[PDB]
Amino acid sequence: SSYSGPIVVDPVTRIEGHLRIEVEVENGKVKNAYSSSTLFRGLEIILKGRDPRDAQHFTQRTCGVCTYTHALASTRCVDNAVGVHIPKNATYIRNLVLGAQYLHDHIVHFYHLHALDFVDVTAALKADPAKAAKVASSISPRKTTAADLKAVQDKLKTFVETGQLGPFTNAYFLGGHPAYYLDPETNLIATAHYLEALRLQVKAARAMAVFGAKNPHTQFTVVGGVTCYDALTPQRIAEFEALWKETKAFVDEVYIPDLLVVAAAYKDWTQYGGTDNFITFGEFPKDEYDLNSRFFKPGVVFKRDFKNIKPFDKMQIEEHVRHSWYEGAEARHPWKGQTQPKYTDLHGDDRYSWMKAPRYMGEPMETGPLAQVLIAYSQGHPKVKAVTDAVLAKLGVGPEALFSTLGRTAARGIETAVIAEYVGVMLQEYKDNIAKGDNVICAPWEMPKQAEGVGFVNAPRGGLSHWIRIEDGKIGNFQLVVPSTWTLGPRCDKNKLSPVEASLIGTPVADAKRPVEILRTVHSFDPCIACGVH
Amino acid sequence: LMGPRRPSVVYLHNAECTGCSESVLRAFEPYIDTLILDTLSLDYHETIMAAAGDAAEAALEQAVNSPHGFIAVVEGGIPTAANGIYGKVANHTMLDICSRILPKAQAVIAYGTCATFGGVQAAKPNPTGAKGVNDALKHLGVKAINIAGCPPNPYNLVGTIVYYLKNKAAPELDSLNRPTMFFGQTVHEQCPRLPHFDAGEFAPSFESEEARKGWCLYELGCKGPVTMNNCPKIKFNQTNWPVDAGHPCIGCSEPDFWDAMTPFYQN
Ligand code: SF4
Numbered sequence: 001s002s003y004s005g006p007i008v009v010d011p012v013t014r015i016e017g018h019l020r021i022e023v024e025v026e027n028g029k030v031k032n033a034y035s036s037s038t039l040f041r042g043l044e045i046i047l048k049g050r051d052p053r054d055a056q057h058f059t060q061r062t063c064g065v066c067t068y069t070h071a072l073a074s075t076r077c078v079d080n081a082v083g084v085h086i087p088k089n090a091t092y093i094r095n096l097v098l099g100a101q102y103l104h105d106h107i108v109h110f111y112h113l114h115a116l117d118f119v120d121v122t123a124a125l126k127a128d129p130a131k132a133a134k135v136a137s138s139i140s141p142r143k144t145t146a147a148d149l150k151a152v153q154d155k156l157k158t159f160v161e162t163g164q165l166g167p168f169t170n171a172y173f174l175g176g177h178p179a180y181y182l183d184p185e186t187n188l189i190a191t192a193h194y195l196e197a198l199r200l201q202v203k204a205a206r207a208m209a210v211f212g213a214k215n216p217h218t219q220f221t222v223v224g225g226v227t228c229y230d231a232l233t234p235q236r237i238a239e240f241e242a243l244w245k246e247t248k249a250f251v252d253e254v255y256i257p258d259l260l261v262v263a264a265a266y267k268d269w270t271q272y273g274g275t276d277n278f279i280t281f282g283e284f285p286k287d288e289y290d291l292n293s294r295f296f297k298p299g300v301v302f303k304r305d306f307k308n309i310k311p312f313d314k315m316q317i318e319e320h321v322r323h324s325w326y327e328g329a330e331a332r333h334p335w336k337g338q339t340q341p342k343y344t345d346l347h348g349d350d351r352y353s354w355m356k357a358p359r360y361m362g363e364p365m366e367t368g369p370l371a372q373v374l375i376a377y378s379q380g381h382p383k384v385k386a387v388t389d390a391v392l393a394k395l396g397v398g399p400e401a402l403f404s405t406l407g408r409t410a411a412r413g414i415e416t417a418v419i420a421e422y423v424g425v426m427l428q429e430y431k432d433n434i435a436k437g438d439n440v441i442c443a444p445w446e447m448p449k450q451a452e453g454v455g456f457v458n459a460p461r462g463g464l465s466h467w468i469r470i471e472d473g474k475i476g477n478f479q480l481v482v483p484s485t486w487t488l489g490p491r492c493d494k495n496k497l498s499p500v501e502a503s504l505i506g507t508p509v510a511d512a513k514r515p516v517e518i519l520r521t522v523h524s525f526d527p528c529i530a531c532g533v534h
Numbered sequence: 535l536m537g538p539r540r541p542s543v544v545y546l547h548n549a550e551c552t553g554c555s556e557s558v559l560r561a562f563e564p565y566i567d568t569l570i571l572d573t574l575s576l577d578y579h580e581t582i583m584a585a586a587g588d589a590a591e592a593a594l595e596q597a598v599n600s601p602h603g604f605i606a607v608v609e610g611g612i613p614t615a616a617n618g619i620y621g622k623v624a625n626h627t628m629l630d631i632c633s634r635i636l637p638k639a640q641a642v643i644a645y646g647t648c649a650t651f652g653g654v655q656a657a658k659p660n661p662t663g664a665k666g667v668n669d670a671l672k673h674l675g676v677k678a679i680n681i682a683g684c685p686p687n688p689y690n691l692v693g694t695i696v697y698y699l700k701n702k703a704a705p706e707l708d709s710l711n712r713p714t715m716f717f718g719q720t721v722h723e724q725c726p727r728l729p730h731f732d733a734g735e736f737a738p739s740f741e742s743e744e745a746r747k748g749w750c751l752y753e754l755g756c757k758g759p760v761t762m763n764n765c766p767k768i769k770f771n772q773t774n775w776p777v778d779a780g781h782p783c784i785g786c787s788e789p790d791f792w793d794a795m796t797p798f799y800q801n
Pocket residue numbers: 061064217549550551552553554609610645646647648649653654683684685686
């Protein structure tokens with residue numbers, strides 16, 4: 001007995017921004033998918049004619065979830081256009097704030113955006129807290145007791161008995177759901193840690209404000225470097241280090257053990273949500289002008305061929321509009337980009353999204369943690385290899401399992417663990433540099449009347465690039481090509497399904513009224529529609 | 535999703551970057567768990583709610599039609615060009631959604647400069663015709679309390695909601711509808727660099743020894759003198775604010791600041 005017909009999920013919640021997912025299902029399995037982004041703002045249009053130094057302040061407001069990332073990309077872009085080589089300490093401080101962004105972002109994603117697809121919070125009320133504490137203590141070096149977990153259960157019981165379920169109202173798990181598999185005890189452990197993570201993320205975000213002024217929307221970058229002389233002081237460094245160490249402890253002792261326990265319970269999710277091609281830009285440079293100096297290196301992989309990673313050629317990016325709400329059908333390289341809105345309503349003239357459709361050598365590319373992890377693994381990155389092997393061994397699966405919704409979710413945790421450790425290495429290198437007597441954080445520069453620039457960030461959702469053409473000292477063109485544009489944009493003028501659309505084909509759907517399986521795969525890509533469309 | 539007991543909040547997302555939602559997650563003493571479990575009932579919020587799709591729309595309808603009443607908190611500007619089509623949720627324009635829901639709220643708080651004044655997507659040439667909530671919905675009699683900033687200090691949202699729940703009334707508001715208890719002083723009059731300003735001690739560049747010694751940032755563009763906010767007093771994340779990180783204020787709690795305060799590095 002299974003469903004044939006359409007399903008629409010609008011709004012897709014527990015993402016950033018405004019997404020409509022449409023699928024066709026045949027006999028209980030998705031046969032076809034459309035990724036429709038339903039808000040446009042037009043920041044590229046707004047930037048025309050302005051001072052290039054102002055760009056980062058506007059583009060940071062592309063997104064407050066991946067806050068900082070676009071200020072960093074625009075600053076790298078204008079740094080590049082003007083030819084300034086920022087001081088070593090500006091690279092360290094920018095890199096440390098970015099590392100802290102990744103930890104905040106991925107913790108919040110797993111617990112506060114993704115986990116309600118897999119955790120039945122109300123079933124936690126049925127759990128035995130003593131048994132749950134035993135299980136929590138067996139998966140982590142941190143000891144959890146029955147009383148620790150009963151406190152959570154007691155608070156949850158008061159909440160549910162009020163009849164005001166708040167954010168849990170009409171949850172797909174209420175009353176039970178055939179695709180929710182966790183036992184009560186594991187639901188209680190995850191619910192406890194969801195709640196804990198609401199307070200831990202405050203500290204993970206504060207780490208960014210220690211050097212970067214505030215979170216959200218940092219204010220310490222300038223063309224040529226950074227502004228925060230106080231970041232050189234031992235007291236601000238100690239403050240950052242203490243917040244980092246507590247955030248890392250949470251990653252290592254709470255997030256990754258929970259990720260592995262939920263993955264182990266949902267091992268069938270190794271069979272859905274795979275994709276073919278991967279792109280990543282690398283991150284955490286030693287040299288701002290050499291992507292191959294980054295701790296994660298750039299790369300391109302087609303058809304899962306990881307023995308043949310291809311170099312990243314920035315000139316092989318084109319953004320399509322044929323199935324998007326923009327004029328015409330011509331794909332453009334972003335240094336020749338165009339943002340000419342033309343709405344035709346849903347599927348009018350075969351157009352169904354405000355995102356453009358970026359293609360690399362004509363192909364749709366997944367970007368984000370799975371691409372960063374798989375490509376760095378295949379480049380022989382020893383930290384990525386150590387963590388990914390340990391994860392596969394704990395789950396008892398082969399490498400092929402990574403090409404899936406479960407694998408992508410696991411890769412997000414892997415990259416969090418690896419970056420959490422690497423933040424301590426960057427912090428020590430920064431300390432050592434200050435101790436050598438280098439106290440410089442900004443370099444002088446001059447605005448050219450005509451220039452091209454590009455800035456590359458591997459953000460928590462993947463390869464981010466900002467592209468400027470300066471004319472008469474002003475912004476002649478400014479184009480953002482953002483990770484979620486790659487992953488969740490629509491089809492191109494060759495009608496190739498985008499990574500999220502292709503990954504949905506084959507998804508089983510147990511209950512079309514509560515299609516949590518579609519959410520599991522969509523959320524595994526960590527969509528950001530404000531990012532994707534800008 | 536809520537009946538008696540905790541006051542119901544309906545949180546809407548229009549044309550926004552979700553930085554205002556993230557700012558509320560940074561709430562400190564009380565933290566956001568206290569706020570969601572004890573203080574308030576968050577009955578619709580697309581970033582964190584469990585339900586999606588039709589179930590989410592039904593959650594919204596149940597909250598808005600509750601005989602107990604609800605407070606609306608609105609993030610993002612409303613795109614009004616081309617009959618509202620640049621922003622839709624569940625295939626309804628954001629203009630339609632807010633026009634139908636906000637007149638039913640017991641109180642409306644416009645949270646962030648986009649909801650208060652139009653914000654980044656309303657900057658020139660405003661291709662989507664984005665407007666702040668009170669501008670867009672003037673004709674329906676909506677008068678949202680405006681808590682400005684990009685994003686605002688979450689202290690200012692919690693303090694306004696607490697005041698409203700205690701006194702059943704808005705606090706004193708300024709001529710931009712912002713609470714005077716948070717927005718009654720310029721950033722500049724509260725700034726630690728004010729003695730340098732008075733002494734004509736300005737940093738000439740960010741690389742300069744004067745910037746290193748903490749001289750005033752006015753020549754580098756600081757909009758502190760024309761911006762009303764409580765940043766130097768409350769700070770952000772319990773630890774810092776833009777001028778103490780060496781960067782000028784960009785004027786982010788003021789209407790039309792994207793066009794009025796630019797170029798950001800000039801005064
Ligand atoms: S006010 Fe600023 S931070 Fe808030 S939604 Fe608008 S752009 Fe984002």
